[PDB]
């Protein structure tokens, strides 16, 4: 908790700063997967295909 010390003629001004360096990570691509549907369902079986 922090009550800010506001009153109608009071201002806080920075006198010094820090350069931050944060880190944002984002996904960009899945593994480009493809499937041979008949090999998955029926692989090595013409009687299934």
């Amino acid at each position: 908790e922090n009550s800010v010390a506001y009153s109608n003629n009071s201002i806080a001004i920075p006198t010094n700063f820090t350069i931050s360096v944060t880190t944002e990570i984002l996904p960009v691509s899945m593994t480009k997967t493809s499937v041979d549907c008949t090999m998955y369902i029926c692989g090595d079986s013409t009687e299934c295909s």
């Binding site: 041979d36 008949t38 090999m39």
Partner: protein, 49 residues
């Protein structure tokens, strides 16, 4: 102009192989079919195979 997935291909198997252990521990058929005698027709004698 482009690239198109016309088909999927598979190397078909060139041979079929079957593998089992060394063929030991046979039944003793010579104890019945190659026996020196057989029981009376009224009294047929049974063994296990």
């Amino acid at each position: 102009k482009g690239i198109y997935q016309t088909s999927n291909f598979r190397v078909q198997p060139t041979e079929s192989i079957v593998r089992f252990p060394n063929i030991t521990n046979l039944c003793p058929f010579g104890e019945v079919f190659n026996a020196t005698r057989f029981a009376s027709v009224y009294a047929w004698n049974r063994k296990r195979i």
